[PDB]
Each structure stands twice: as structure tokens, then as C-alpha cells.
Paper text:
Cyclodipeptide synthases (CDPSs) use aminoacylated tRNA (aa-tRNA) substrates to form peptide bonds between two amino acids yielding a cyclic dipeptide product (CDP). ParaCDPS from Parabacteroides sp. 20_3 (GenBank: EFK64745.1) produces cyclo(His-Phe)8 whilst ParcuCDPS from [name] (GenBank: ETB63777.1) can synthesise both cyclo(His-Glu) and cyclo(His-Pro)9. ParcuCDPS displays a Rossman-fold common throughout the CDPS family.
We solved the crystal structure of ParcuCDPS at a resolution of 1.90 Å (9 residues out of the total 230 were not traceable), uncovering unique characteristics of histidine substrate selection. The active site includes the four conserved residues previously identified: S26, Y167, E171 and Y191. Additionally, we hypothesised D58 was acting as a potential active site residue, within hydrogen bond distance from the catalytic serine (S26), which could be important for S26 to act as a nucleophile. Moreover, the side chain of the predicted catalytically important Y167 points away from the active site, removing the conventional hydrogen bonding network seen in other CDPSs. ParcuCDPS structure diverges from the common fold in helix α3 and beta-strand β3, where these regions change direction. In the common CDPS fold helix α3 and α4 exist as a single continuous helix whereas, in ParcuCDPS a flexible glycine residue (G84) provides a significant bend and change of direction, splitting the helix into two. This structural change of β3 facilitates the placement of D58 into H-bonding distance of the active site S26. CASTp38 was used to investigate the pocket volume of ParcuCDPS and highlighted pocket residues which are unique. P1 (shown in blue in Fig. 4c) is found deeper within the enzyme and is smaller and more restricted in size than P2 which sits at the solvent-accessible edge of the CDPS. From these calculations, P1 is predicted to be mostly neutral apart from Tyr55 and Glu174 which form a negatively charged microenvironment, while P2 is predicted to be mostly lined by positively charged residues.
Residue numbers in the entry: 1 to 60, 70 to 230
Amino acid sequence: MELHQIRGCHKNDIELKKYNIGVAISLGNKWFSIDNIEKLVKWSLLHTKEYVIIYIADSIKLSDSHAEEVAIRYGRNLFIKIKERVSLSFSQDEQAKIIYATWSDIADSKYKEKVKYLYNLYDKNINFKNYIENFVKEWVSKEKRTFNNNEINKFGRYILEELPELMVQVKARGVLFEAYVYPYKTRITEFVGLLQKGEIFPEIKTNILDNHPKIFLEVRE
């Protein structure tokens, strides 16, 4: 498990341990075994400025929020398994560095304003809508299962709920994490890169981004 590639800072910034580090779990993504999650947490604990923040980054009716429904249906059980593994593999003083951040811990008033900006843009701007929708379609085209165009549209909205967390530096339980680790570059991480640079949908950068962009750390075996 090692750093393969870096967006948002230089390699030295990491070795100087400048930043707190989030571990961004894609729940239901088959790479995110408990074993692989534990190895990302191990790596992040050895490179972090202080804290490691574990959270659910994406999900690819008991709540109005899809991320919240995923948090209560599946995220809580995942977090319990992770904690158990951690308490058996790490020392007490290492365990004190780890923060388990639920959707609620991240989606505060300021965060939700950003999501709401994106929802309104999804509704008023048909170029944005179609870009997000074609976005869902390409990933589903890699799946055997099929989806109707109303499901495609609903999945797009779900992406918008997590987009600010990938784009901007947010706090979990009061702790800023400037960087996050993820094992591979994806179409979503490339999209966020352009968004942060104002090279796609520049209105988004104007309206919800803050000149402190989320650093992406590509970490895999």
C-alpha cells in the first residue's frame, strides 16, 4: 500500500505530514473489503498530520436524503465492523486518532447549502443535468443490470449530495481534513479536478468552492 499519484499538493507536503486524511469508502464497491479498508487506515495513520477520518464517500424510503438512508441501513453496520477490526489491529493510542464520520457528522448547515445549490442547478440548467445524467449512464453501462431514465435521473441527484465533500475541505465532528485517500482515479475524481480548476461548469466553483480544494491521494497496493 503506497502513494501512487497526488492531486492538490506536492509529494513533500505529504511526507511533512501537513494534512489530516480522510478514508473515503465506496460502500458496496468490491475493492472496499475490511482488509483493504484496514490497510488504507494503516497508511493514513502513518502519513496523517494528526487524525484519520473514516467516512462513506458514495453508495453506487426512510429518509429524504439518500446518503442518510445508506448511512442508517448499511453505513452503521460497516462502521461497527471497521471499529472491531481496528481495536484488534491498532494500539489504544492509534485508535484515538480515528474519527468515524457519519453522513450527519459531515452534512451540516453549510454543507447542505452547497448540495442545495447543486440541486437547483440540476433543475434549472439542462446542460448540467444532462452531463450528470450521461455520467450515471456510463457507469451503468459497465454493469449487467439495466435502469430506466427516471432511475438514471434519481441516481444523478444522489451524486450531487456527495459532490461538495469531494470538492471542498469540510469538517467531520469539528475536524478539518484537507486530503482523502482513494485507491484509483475515477471519472468522478477527474470531474472534480476540472470543477476545482473552473474548467467545467465554472459557476459551481464560483458558488460553492473556496480556494482550499480537497487534496486527492491515490493509494493502492
